[PDB]
Structures are given as structure tokens and as C-alpha cells.
């Protein structure tokens, strides 16, 4: 069909790269399924919340992490104030997406961005970053979901190999 | 001895899909710039618009330009390239009869930002959480005499005069207004107030929030 | 810099490490031995340093049977300001345009996963030792010292008197 | 010296040992300028000029200059401090002078500017570097024009030439012999040996420009027609 | 070996043309990355057919742990092996000569330089873990000597005394020591 | 040498201003005030820059000196020496007739946590605000005019420095100053 | 500085214990016993560690002198000064109330053959069994509990170091 | 294919490479059309002058930078005298190309070659390095003639 | 049928010259060795390893003949074992040359003491080549 299946595994990366892959999954017409494995950094947790609500799964071994925007600043005294205010705009940006997608107020999330803190799989469903726990039972449904969407393209592949032979 | 004629979308649909990801974007008339303006990456974008205007049948489909680069000024402030390289970009992009639909993903640092407003009016696409910056450009390390600094001052004099002429045609302002608003200090622009200023017009086509899709269900 | 040794003036300059802390307490062994009545004035100017190096000069100043005087010169970032607050009450002076910064001290954790948790307990014990001793020097509560020591907080010399960092300022 | 330079000094007495070489020469009102003229040694020459000022106000303070260049503002601070003292200064040029050490030997008093036979002098416009935005590029060209206008009227006061001759000389890299610098007014007396009157090749080219020597009759000079 | 060759009708590389001809070439040193390509090549030829595998070695030395990965794949496969020497096999490369083909399948050139010595290792840190890695290096030293004693027929007490120091062999002494089987002639 | 000028109560401020070079001038300034609180102290400033933390200690040391101070600017005064130039007593401020004066804000780098950036961002702004209000006292200039002249990174000739209020007298009778 | 107190037998073990640094401590230790063998020698401890054979050179040189030995710990002593803190006689082992006492086993080094690894293995196995016999002498502790204490890294406060037997008194009382 | 089209967009390099591209364009029998984008350095302006006169196009944003070539190396005393006569002969060799293609006098070329001389789009036509200002139409005929 | 290779080498270890020596005699057919420019010690072993009667050389080619070189560092015992290694390798390459030049072996060790170079004339007299191409 038209479903997009992305896998999430990143322990670092810049904060701006996570927002680009967030809205790259928003403007897709069809649904999107995001599966978090290993960790979820500041660039990876935004990709995890960018999927369709109801198809987000986090395994027990995966650990979601919320991180402040790290940046490199160098310039004069007039230039050091304008880019540090952009850090306040990015901190307003990542707290806005975390508020509209997790059913949480903006004040309680902004009390979490001042210090780095790692989250577990049980705290991911409680905050609202995901929907279900990716246990061994619901992982079998992910195997059968990616089998029908790949055989829809492989049925055309089976007809091209028989026509060439 | 036979001529190597190119094939296009009404003709190459029987030859299968392109194998590599830049070649899927070249068939879809979409140029994605994920690298700053190096002398290696500027040669392919000149050959790309030369290929799109080579044997196109209708020559009227809008060319999508997605830019994500630092231009010629990096994050630290020095010049990794010069401003004369952008003059080869706008002269080659504006040559074709096709309209130029311009989009931004994340960033446009003082060279890609003036190319963002230089597209077709009414179709400036943008992501709702991007950053736009318009600052006057700088020069690299030049060690000369007193008359050598004067000729380098004339190169940046033509840089602010050419960049404000693009912003005067896009935003509909005067020549001295764009120099005082944009090309004076290193400032930044968000997505919402840039629509009131005149940098962008709308968002990307087909954009819809995943929470707004849950409200429809 | 040898003229300050006869005037009972020692210099605390730069980041405090192991060879500076051995030299600083060596000058303190001699100045109290020649006279146990006259004070010792110290000019503190440090941007930080080690955890155990600043604690090696803190305890030896309490053993000096006359009082000492501490004067801030320029800046004290999270290690020199602890040496200012450990002085005698009524002898803590500072410049009117100096700067006082209070922050938790720096320190790494290199080794095994069992090793980095048993050595971070010492850093958590160093945080209870630093904030536990600083609360008795400033007269404030225990909560307000542990609330501002996590992030860097610069303090003006005018507001350092009401908070309890210094006692007076030398204007003249 | 590739690896190390030993302390070349002499202090000898029948009862007590004296100081080293540079401390003894500083007590005899002789200052040495060696190495690069940065901001560190600029306070050494000015500070020794104020040290010998308080000792005696009438004796001639002598400054020996041997430097391949230096900082343009640090070499500016030694000239105007030398012109704002009471006694006269006798300058002696040593080694070479590259666009900054040629200024301090020309900044001496008239009649006391002594240059040697094989000294190299040079006069050019000051250099510099562009930096960043156009608000600093315009500040850079206004700084290089300020350093060029200050150094222009320095040579007008000490040599008495015209401003057109300075702009034609400081346009490119111009090296001057002391026999040529005596005509320009940079120095006052040429120092020679025991009857040493050898002609440098800059004057042989100068003799070829006026028409005194040809290729057929080279005279008792060195060969110059090997171009 | 940079120009390629042909298999029967198309262009194939020189090392891969002998792969279809069941000849394995080893020219570089035994490292972790080239040992991953060798033990994956032994399982690929074992799955296709069951014939004798030929190994031509040029190893000037290598590590201990990836060499034991290639040694254990010789005994695991159900096919036969034969090691032939040309050039030089130094360090752990000389041990792979005595890996398989004990029943008259160890050939060598008349000018091959052989080398046998005890393996080595390096791991520092805590003093308590230094005792554990010393037990690993001791258990790797006597086990490597037990395989050379069974393949060459030498007594076990002589391999500990001789291979602890530096030892080099010519192909004339490699016959009487049982390290190789036959010597290659001019044809 | 340098010890001959020390007994005549003349110190030198040369080179780049560091933390090790800051307290060496402060320690010898209080020794001259304890010896003679009536005799003036002449200083010589030649600095191409420095830190704003150690440079303020030189300004507080001259304010702590009970005796009058005299300043002399030779060579360079870039963003730290021009602040220490006008900070002396009014009427006793001399310099060379061709020395350069640079009035510009200090520099600084910022890195680390997101809460760590906004602390040092307003700290260097408070250093910019304190350096503007202090330098506006002895210059007899308004605050809005002196806060924009320090933003321009252009040097100042000593001819226009006299009516600006930063300096009082010029050594040389004010005719040797070249534009 | 250090020379103004060297005539009154003041030894400062500053910095990392190296081959040249510890040798300066040994060479000045033989000077103090040769001039007067009846008065005490004070040794200050402020060091983050050092070598195994160099740090052992301070202990046996202090046992070579026939006079009395006082040892004081300043700041941190990590497995080299902490072993040298309890090396003095009983009754004159004083410590500061805020000084950190770090107990750790020493390290080793080997580069050559695999038979050279086991030589250095039993060489550090002999050094580990040597210091456990020494540290159990002045502490009155059995060998079972003193071997596991050197296994993991443990920073010890001087409140529990008094009952452990490593120190004797606390300067200041609290 | 009686005409070739080479886009010139580079920062330039050694002066020996700019001589070869200029001599090769004046040797072939087919026409040579040269179009510049950005700037034309010392190795690029010889390819700009290497084209035939009449079809040298530059855009409005195009600049032109002319300067004498650098070089030099370390050696003995008489070794520097040999190569300094060569740099002065190469500087006279590039002055012969600029005087022939642009019809300028030889004494005025060396005055502009003495310093880093930059040119705009307007004065490049007035100097003689190009022919007319490029536009859309001058390159629309280029892409349609190469299709057959 | 007949192998034809170009010999050109100015450096390299002589241990690799023994690998290319025995590989040339492994071929049943003849070998044509044609040296161009420089022939080092690793290249002269492949030049002498060819078939007698088909070793060509040009007028400007030269042949470098020298003893093996090595780098030894470590314990005292394995230096003495490796000292016999470089000695018998030098005795091995002397026996390689002796099968072609038909000279006594004691005279070749005197030429293998230092670096020995030959022009196109005395290469034929010393038996490394056959004729001039």
C-alpha cells in the first residue's frame, strides 16, 4: 500500500535534524509507523512522535531521552545575544511539539527541559510520547503488518521475473 | 555514432525506476541541496538545470528547489566560500522558462535565504518550524595594502546592492529599505512573522498535523 | 612577587591544582610561625579547580589561631568563593566591582560501571560537604543553598553582603 | 645558533663581580634593539629611555637598532616618546631595517643619524588584513589610510622631501643603500672603514641611469651588465 | 593482481576466478577484517560442492584471535583441505600450514621461509583482571602447542622449549620435523 | 631598568592583559600608596586587549589608591587600555600625540548547557552595561551617545579625543597630532 | 616555600609519584636521619597516586631511619599516600577532618611475549600479597577483610578511618 | 557540432594551465563559444579571451579579476635570478594575449596587471574581455542546437 | 603461451623477490624477461629467474645488486637468531645468482658486500642478461 515503516535508533545528533524528520513525516498523506529501538535521543524522540498516533511502539530495552538544544556560539557582544535568544526559540519549539502530541500542559514539560533526564518504556506511555508497549506479543503484529505491505510490491516483482523468463 | 538522446517521463516510464536517490529526485524535477556551497557541489546544479532544459517537451512544469545549507557563511562566522559563487546559481536557475518553486527545510544562512524569496510569488513553501537568517556577507583572509582593502570593500558593496535588489522585487520594498531591515545586522526570522514580512507565503503542500488528523477521526 | 611574602600576603592565582595547593599551605605554615597575632591577607583570583585541592587549603586556614582576611580580586568562580566564605566574620572584604560565582565543582568519572557509581557517591558527598559548610557560613537555610548551586549564578558585591558571602567592601 | 645561545657576558673585578653585558651597556646610556618589535620589548626600550632620562638630562642617549621589522603600533610608540624628551638621541643603524626599523633611525636628531656601510634600509606602505563584515572592512581601510597618513608626514619632518617622492617610493618594495639614503635625507653620515670606498651595485645602476658608465668602459666597478 | 581475468565467457577478477576453481589465495596479513572474508568463503565453497580446498599463503604475521577463527573452520566443514606454501608464512601464518591436510597434502616451495613462535597479547588496567588475561594467554599458549604436536608428530615437551624462543625453518628441515609433507619441484 | 622606575613610583602596563599580569600591577600599586599617600603615581598603558574580569581589577586598584594617579598612553590601547586611560584623575591625563585609542566592547565565547548559555549571555550584557555607565562619568557625555560609539569598531585619533572628554592634555602642545 | 621548612624535617609528597619525584623524597629522607637521629620527622601527604615500585620506595626508606615518624594527610591520598599514611608508628598518625582517604589496588604493565605477561602477573601478585601483610600490621585487621577492601575503589571519611586502624587522631577534634 | 560551449566558473589556478586552454581553443577548426559564470581569474580569463570574437557572453552578476601570477621558490643566489626573469617573461606573455584579444595597448595592460584589478559586468564590455551582456535568449539558442 | 612481463623496480624488500622467483620456474613454458630503466635487488631476482637465452636488456638500463636489509629491535636472544636469518638469506640469493652466471660463489659474496651497479655492457659479461635489445 502506501504505509511508511521507519525504525528509530540514534544515541545523539543535532536537535535541528530531529525537527526536519518530524515534519517530513507529517505532510505524508498516508499513515506512518515508528518503532523505537535501543534509545531515543533529542533527534530520535522527535522522529518517534512524528508518526501516526496509535502506531507508535517502544520496546522494553529502548530508553527515551529528552535533551536541551546544544549549540556552538562565537562572536561579538552584539552577536552573542541574538543567537542565544534562538536557543529560547528552539526550547519553545520542542516544548510546543511535546505539548500538542502528548496531551500535556506546557508548564510541566518546560520544568523538564532545564535538566537532562532519561525515560524508560513505562514512562513513555505515561507521558504520551508513544501509545503501546512493544512487547513480544505485539511485535508479531509488526512482522505480519510489514509482510502484506511488502508483498503488494513483491507481487509486481513476481510478475516481472516470470515475464523476463 | 548514434546520438545519445535523453529520455523523459513520457518516454522513460517503460525503462524502470532510477536506482539511486538523487536520480529519483532528478526525474521528479526536484533539486535537494543538503550541502553548503562548495566548488564541487555547484557544478552539478548547473548541469541539472541544463539537463532539465535540454529536451523537455512542455518546459512549463514548476521546478522544486529544496535548500538546506549554510550558504557561504558557516556557524562560526568565517567565510568557507565567497559570495560570487551565488551569482552563478541565480543566473543559471532563472534562465529556464519554467517557474521556480522554492522551499526550505531547516536553515538558510544569508545566501540561501535570498534565494528563498527569489522564487515564484504565491508558492514560497516552508516548513512551520524552520529558521531563516539574513545577514550581510563576509570575506575570507586577505592580506594586502591600503588600496587592497578598498577593492575588497567594493566587492561587498556590490553584494549588498545585489541582495537588496532581489528583496525589493520579492517583498515589494525600496532599495534602501532592504539594506536597513535585512542586510545591516545578523538577525533571524521565524516562520510566522516572515509571512507578514514577505519572505514566505504558505507552508508545504499536503501538510497536516497528526493530532489534527486524530481530531477528524 | 617576593615582596608580598614579607608583608604576610599570599597570592591565590589561577586554577587550584595539587602543586599549587602544596605551595599555598607551605606559605601558611611560615606566616603563623613567625607571628600568631597578626592576620594574613590573601588575594583570591581563581576561575575554578579541583575538588580535593580547594578542600586542602580550606581546613588549614581554620587551624590558624589568629584570624585571616580574604579580599576578592576580579573573579572567583565556584572554588575561590568558597575560600572567601570560610574566612573570619568581619574580615571578608571584596572589591566593589568584583564578581562572585557559586556553582558545584567540576569532576569526572572514569572507570568501570561499578566504579563510576561508587565515585559519583563521593561527588554527591562532596556536594553535601560543600553546601553543608556554605550554609553555616552565610546563615541561610539549607534549601536555598542547594537550589542555586546546580547552575552558575553570578553575584554582585553589593548583593553579596545581604546574602552573606562577604562582610564589607573596600571603597575608600 | 641552532640549539642554544650561551650568555656572552664579561664581569671582572679585583674585589667584586660586575653585571652582565646588556646591564653594563644600559648603564653607559646605550640601548640595544634586537629581534621582533612586539608589544613586550616596546616597554623595554621606552622604559629604559625613561630610566636614563632621570639619571642625566643633558647626555646623549644612544640607541642601537637591529631588527627585521615589528608591530606597526609598537614601533610607533618608541618614535613619539623619543621626540618628547629633553636630550638629543644619537641613533646607529645595525644589520638591516625593514619598513619599521628604518623609521627609528630616521627619527634621530639632525647630525647624529649614523648608518654603516652594509646596512639595509627599506620604506613601504604598512600592511594589514581584512576581517569579516563590511562595517569592519570600511574600518580596516580607514585604519590603513590612517597609518599611511601618519607615516607620510613623519618622513616630511625628518628628511624634508616632497610627498610625491614618498608615494613613488613606498608604493612597492624599495630597498635603499646608505649612499642612496644620504641623498634622500634619512641619515646624516656614512660610516666606512680604513679608506673603504667600495661602490655598491645600487649606485652602479644609478650611474647607468645618468649615463656615466657604459658596457664598453665599465671602469673600476663591479659588473652589472649580466642581466 | 589488479587486472581481472575470465571464467568461461565474461570478465571476472583474478581472486574470484580461482574461487570458482576452488583455489583460495591469502596475500596480506591476518587481521580481523580479512578473516571475516575468509571464514565466509570457506562456508560458501562447502555448501556448493565437497572437494579439496587449496590455500596459498603469504602471511607475514598477524593476530591470535582471528587466526583461530580460520583454523576452526577447517575442521568444521565436511570437505577436505590442502595447504600449499609459496613465499613466506611468519608468526600465526605458519600455524595455518599445519591446520589440515596431514595425510600428504602440505606442499611448499624450496625457498619458503618458515617461522614458528609462541603467540602474544597485550591488555592492561586493573591488577585483578591482569591475572585473568594471563590465564587466557597461558591457556592459548599450550593449546597452540598441542595442535602442532599432533599434526607434526613432535613430542609436546620439545615444542614448549623450542617455540618459546625465536625459531626459523628451511624446507630441508621442514621434512624431517613433520611440518610439511612434500616439496614442490620445478613442474 | 624596571626597578629604577619602581622607586620613582612609575609602573608599566605592557603586553596582553592576563590574570597573572593583573595582580602584579595591583600588588605594586598598594605598596606605593602605603609609602607615600601624597605623591602621584604615573602609569604607562600599552595593551592590545585583555579579559574584562582581570581588567576591572586594575580599575578598582586605582580607585583604591588614595593618592592621585597619572596616565600615559603609548603604543596601543585596544578595548581595555582606553577604559583605563580616562579612569584616572581629571586634569592629569596625558598621552603621546600619535597614539591610537580604541573604544569597543570586550569579547567572549559561550558553550555548554541551554541554561548555561543564557547565564553568560546576560553576564556579558551586564559587563557591557557596567562598562558604559562607568566610562560615562569622567567623560561628561550622555549615556545614549556613549553606548553607540563603543559599538563601532573604529580607532580614535587623539585630536578628537580631547573634546570627547576621554583625555585632558596632549604632550606636544597639540600641534604634532596628525590626522 | 619548601626550603624554609626543610631544616625542621618537613617532607611534602606533592604531585604524582614518578621515578624522579619519589627519588627526591628518598634522597632528602637520608639527610634528616644523618644529622639528628633523636627528633621526629614530619611527612605531609597530598598526592593522587603514582607508580607501584616508586611509591613503595618511600615506605621502606622511612623504616630505614631510627628516629620517630609523624605523618599528616592533606586532601586526597589515592593508594600511594594512603598506604604511606598508616606507614608511621602508632599514636602519631593524625589526619584532617575533611581529607579523603582512597583505598585502591596498584596497577601493572607488560608489553612483550605471553611468557612476559605471566612474569609481570606474578610480580604484581607478589606486590599485592606484600602490601596486604603490611597494611594488616598497623591496623590490627585480619587478611580476609583487608583483601576485599582493596578490590573495589572506596573513598573513606576520617570518622570511620579511626576505628579501621589506618589513622590514630583527628586534628581539631571534629 | 561546429560550435562548443564550455561554462567558465572557477577561482583559477596556476598560470601554466590557463595558457594551454587558451592555445587549444584557438587551434581547433570548429567554433568556440565561451560563457562565464561568477568570476574569471588569471587561469579563467585566458579561456575567456581564448574564444572567438563575437560570442563572448557575461551575465549581469558576472565579475572579472585580472592579476599577475604568483610563484617563487627557495634556492641559491643565481637560481632566483633565472626564474625571476621567467616570471617577468610570463607576465609579458599574458600581456600579449590581453593586448591581441582586447586590442589594448601593451603599456596599459601592465598597469592593470600590477595590482588585483576587479571588473564589473559593465566595464568588462568596455575593456574588451567580453562582447555583450548575456541574457536568456543568448543561451536559449545554445540548448536547442545541441539536441540534433 | 610464453609469459612476457616488464621489469621495473627501484626499491622494495628482497623477500618479495624470492616469491616472484619461484613463481617463474613454476610455469612449464618459457619466460621472457625484459628489463627497462631501473632493476633493483627484488627486480634482478626476477631477471635472473627467467629462461636462459631469453633475457633482454636495453642500452640505458641498469641493475642494482646489494645485500638484504632489515630492522631488528628487542630482546637479546632473538637478535642472534635473526642475525642468522639475514646471513643465510644473503647466502640463499647468492646461490640463486650462481645457477645462471656460472661463477664461483666466493666472488659473488664480495660483490654482495656493498652496493653494486652494472651498465648494459658488463651485464652480459656477468651473466644477468643475454643480449642488447
Swiss-Prot record, chain H:
Residues at the active site: 42 (nucleophile), 67
Cellular compartment(s): Plastid, Chloroplast stroma
This protein's domain notes: This gene contains one large insertion sequence (IS1) that divides the clpP gene into two sequence domains. The insertion sequence forms a continuous open reading frame with its upstream and downstream sequence domains.
Similarity-based family: Belongs to the peptidase S14 family.
Subunit structure, interactors included: Component of the chloroplastic Clp protease core complex.
UniProt function note: Cleaves peptides in various proteins in a process that requires ATP hydrolysis. Has a chymotrypsin-like activity. Plays a major role in the degradation of misfolded proteins.
Protein known as: ATP-dependent Clp protease proteolytic subunit
Source organism (scientific name): Chlamydomonas reinhardtii (Chlamydomonas smithii)
Lineage of the species this protein comes from: Eukaryota, Viridiplantae, Chlorophyta, core chlorophytes, Chlorophyceae
Residue span relative to the full protein: 346 to 493 of 524
Amino acid at each position: 500500500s502506501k504505509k511508511v515503516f521507519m525504525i528509530i535508533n540514534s544515541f545523539g545528533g543535532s536537535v535541528g535534524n530531529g525537527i526536519t524528520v518530524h515534519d517530513a513525516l507529517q505532510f505524508i498523506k498516508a499513515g506512518s509507523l515508528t518503532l523505537a529501538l535501543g534509545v531515543a535521543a533529542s533527534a530520535a524522540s522527535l522522529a518517534l512522535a512524528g508518526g501516526t498516533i496509535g502506531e507508535r511502539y517502544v520496546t522494553e530495552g529502548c530508553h527515551t531521552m529528552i535533551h536541551q538544544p546544544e549549540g556552538g556560539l562565537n562572536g561579538q557582544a552584539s552577536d552573542i545575544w541574538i543567537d542565544s535568544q534562538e536557543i529560547m526559540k528552539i526550547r519553545l519549539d520542542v516544548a510546543e511539539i511535546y505539548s500538542l502530541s502528548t496531551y500535556r500542559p506546557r508548564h510541566k514539560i518546560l520544568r523538564d527541559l532545564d535538566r537532562d533526564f532519561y525515560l524508560t518504556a513505562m514512562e513513555t506511555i505515561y507521558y504520551g510520547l508513544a501509545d503501546e508497549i512493544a512487547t513480544n506479543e505485539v511485535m508479531h503484529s509488526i512482522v505480519e503488518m510489514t509482510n502484506q505491505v511488502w508483498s503488494y510490491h513483491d507481487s509486481k516483482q513476481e510478475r516481472l521475473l516470470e515475464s523476463r523468463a | 555514432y548514434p546520438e545519445g538522446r535523453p529520455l523523459f517521463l513520457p518516454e522513460a516510464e517503460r525503462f524502470g525506476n532510477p536506482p539511486d536517490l538523487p536520480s529519483l529526485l532528478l526525474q521528479q524535477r526536484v533539486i535537494y541541496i543538503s550541502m553548503p556551497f562548495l566548488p564541487s557541489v555547484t557544478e552539478l546544479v548547473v548541469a541539472q538545470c541544463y539537463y532539465l532544459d535540454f529536451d523537455d517537451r512542455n518546459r512549463q512544469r514548476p521546478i522544486y528547489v529544496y535548500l538546506n545549507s549554510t550558504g557561504c557563511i558557516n556557524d562560526k562566522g568565517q567565510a568557507i566560500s565567497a559570495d560570487n559563487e551565488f551569482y552563478a546559481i541565480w543566473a543559471a536557475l532563472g534562465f529556464t522558462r519554467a517557474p521556480l518553486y522554492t522551499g526550505v527545510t531547516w536553515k538558510a544562512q544569508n545566501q540561501a535565504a535570498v534565494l528563498l524569496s527569489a522564487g515564484q510569488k504565491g508558492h514560497r513553501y516552508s516548513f512551520p518550524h524552520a529558521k531563516i537568517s539574513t545577514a550581510p556577507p563576509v570575506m575570507n583572509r586577505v592580506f594586502g595594502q591600503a588600496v587592497d582593502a578598498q577593492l575588497q570593500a567594493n566587492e561587498l558593496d556590490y553584494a549588498t546592492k545585489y541582495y537588496a535588489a532581489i528583496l525589493a522585487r520579492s517583498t515589494g520594498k525600496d532599495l534602501e529599505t532592504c539594506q536597513k531591515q535585512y542586510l545591516s545586522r545578523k538577525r533571524y526570522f521565524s516562520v510566522k512573522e516572515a509571512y507578514e514580512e514577505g519572505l514566505v507565503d504558505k507552508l508545504v503542500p499536503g501538510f497536516m498535523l497528526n493530532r489534527f488528523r486524530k481530531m477528524q477521526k | 612577587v617576593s615582596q608580598l611574602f614579607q608583608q604576610r600576603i599570599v597570592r591565590l592565582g589561577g586554577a587550584v591544582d595539587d602543586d599549587m595547593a602544596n605551595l599555598l599551605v607551605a606559605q601558611l605554615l611560615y606566616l603563623d610561625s613567625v607571628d600568631n597575632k597578626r592576620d594574613i591577607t590573601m588575594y583570591v583570583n581563581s576561575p575554578g579547580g579541583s575538588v580535593t585541592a580547594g578542600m586542602a587549603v580550606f581546613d588549614t586556614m581554620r587551624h590558624i589561631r589568629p584570624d585571616v582576611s580574604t579580599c576578592c580580586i576580579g573573579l572567583a568562580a565556584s572554588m575561590g568563593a568558597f575560600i572567601l566564605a570560610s574566612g573570619q566574620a568581619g574580615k571578608r572584604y571584596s572589591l566593589p566591582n568584583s564578581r562572585i560565582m557559586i556553582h558545584q565543582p567540576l569532576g569526572g568519572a572514569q572507570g568501570q560501571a561499578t566504579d563510576i557509581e561508587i565515585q559519583a557517591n563521593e561527588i554527591l558527598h562532596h556536594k553535601l560537604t560543600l553546601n553543608g559548610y556554605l550554609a553555616q557560613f552565610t546563615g541561610q537555610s539549607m534549601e536555598t543553598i542547594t537550589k542555586d548551586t546546580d547552575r552558575d549564578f553570578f553575584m554582585s558585591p553589593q548583593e553579596a553582603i545581604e546574602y552573606g558571602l562577604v562582610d564589607a567592601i573596600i571603597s575608600k | 645558533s641552532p640549539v642554544v645561545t650561551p650568555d656572552i657576558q664579561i664581569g671582572h673585578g679585583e674585589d667584586a663581580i660586575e653585571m652582565d653585558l646588556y646591564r653594563y651597556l644600559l648603564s653607559n646610556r646605550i640601548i640595544f634593539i634586537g629581534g621582533y618589535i612586539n608589544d613586550k620589548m616596546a616597554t623595554q626600550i621606552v622604559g629604559s629611555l625613561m630610566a636614563l632620562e632621570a639619571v642625566d638630562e643633558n647626555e646623549d642617549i644612544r640607541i642601537y637598532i637591529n631588527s627585521p621589522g615589528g608591530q606597526p603600533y609598537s614601533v610607533l610608540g618608541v618614535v613619539d616618546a623619543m621626540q618628547s624628551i629633553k636630550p638629543d638621541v644619537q641613533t646607529v643603524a645595525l644589520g638591516a631595517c625593514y619598513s619599521y626599523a628604518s623609521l627609528v633611525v630616521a627619527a634621530g636628531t639632525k647630525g647624529k643619524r649614523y648608518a654603516m656601510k652594509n646596512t639595509r634600509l627599506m620604506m613601504t606602505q604598512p600592511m594589514g588584513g581584512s576581517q569579516g563584515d563590511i562595517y569592519q572592512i570600511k574600518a580596516t581601510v580607514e585604519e590603513l589610510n590612517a597609518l599611511y597618513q601618519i607615516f607620510s608626514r613623519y618622513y616630511m619632518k625628518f628628511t624634508g622631501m616632497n610627498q610625491d617622492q614618498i608615494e613613488q617610493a613606498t608604493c612597492r618594495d624599495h630597498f635603499m643603500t646608505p649612499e642612496q639614503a644620504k641623498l634622500e635625507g634619512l641619515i646624516d653620515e656614512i660610516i666606512r672603514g680604513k679608506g673603504d670606498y667600495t661602490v655598491p651595485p645600487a649606485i652602479v645602476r644609478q650611474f647607468r641611469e645618468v649615463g656615466l658608465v657604459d658596457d664598453l668602459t665599465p671602469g673600476p666597478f663591479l659588473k652589472v651588465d649580466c642581466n | 593482481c589488479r587486472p581481472p581475468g575470465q571464467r568461461q565467457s565474461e570478465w571476472v577478477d583474478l581472486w574470484e576466478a580461482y574461487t570458482y576453481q576452488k583455489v583460495v589465495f591469502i596475500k596480506e596479513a591476518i587481521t580481523e577484517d580479512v578473516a571475516n572474508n575468509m571464514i565466509a568463503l570457506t562456508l560458501y565453497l562447502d555448501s556448493l560442492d565437497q572437494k579439496r580446498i587449496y590455500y596459498w599463503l603469504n602471511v607475514p604475521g598477524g593476530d591470535v584471535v582471528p587466526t583461530l577463527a580460520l583454523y576452526d573452520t577447517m575442521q568444521y566443514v565436511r570437505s577436505k583441505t590442502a595447504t600449499v606454501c609459496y613465499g613466506l608464512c611468519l608468526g600465526m601464518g605458519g600455524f595455518l600450514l599445519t591446520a589440515g591436510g596431514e595425510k600428504g597434502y602440505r606442499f611448499a616451495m624450496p625457498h619458503s621461509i618458515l617461522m614458528m613462535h609462541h603467540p602474544s597479547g597485550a591488555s592492561r588496567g586493573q591488577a585483578s583482571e591482569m591475572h585473568i588475561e594471563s590465564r587466557e594467554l597461558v591457556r592459548m599458549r599450550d593449546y597452540l602447542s598441542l595442535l602442532t604436536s599432533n599434526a607434526t608428530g613432535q613430542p609436546y615437551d620439545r615444542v614448549i622449549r623450542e617455540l618459546s624462543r625465536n625459531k626459523w625453518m628451511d624446507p630441508k628441515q621442514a621434512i624431517e620435523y613433520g611440518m610439511i609433507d612434500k616439496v614442490l619441484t620445478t613442474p | 631598568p624596571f626597578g629604577l622606575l619602581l622607586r620613582q613610583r612609575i609602573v608599566f602596563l605592557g603586553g596582553e592583559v592576563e590574570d597573572f599580569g593583573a595582580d602584579a600591577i595591583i600588588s605594586q600599586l598598594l605598596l606605593l600608596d602605603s609609602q607615600d599617600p601624597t605623591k602621584d603615581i604615573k602609569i604607562f598603558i600599552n595593551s592590545p586587549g585583555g579579559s574584562v574580569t582581570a581588567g576591572m581589577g586594575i580599575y578598582d586598584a586605582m580607585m583604591l589608591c588614595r593618592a592621585d594617579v597619572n596616565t600615559y598612553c603609548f603604543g596601543l590601547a585596544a578595548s581595555m587600555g582606553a577604559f583605563l586611560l580616562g579612569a584616572g584623575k581629571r586634569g592629569k591625563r596625558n598621552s603621546m600625540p600619535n597614539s591610537r585609542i580604541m573604544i569597543h566592547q570586550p569579547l567572549g565565547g559561550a558553550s555548554g548547557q541551554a541554561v548555561d548559555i543564557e547565564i553568560q549571555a546576560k553576564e556579558i550584557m551586564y559587563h557591557k552595561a557596567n562598562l558604559n555607565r562607568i566610562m560615562a562619568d569622567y567623560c561628561q557625555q550622555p549615556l545614549s551617545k556613549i553606548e553607540e560609539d563603543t559599538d563601532r569598531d573604529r580607532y580614535m585619533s587623539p585630536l578628537e579625543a580631547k573634546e570627547y572628554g576621554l583625555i585632558d592634555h596632549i604632550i606636544g602642545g597639540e600641534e604634532a597630532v596628525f590626522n
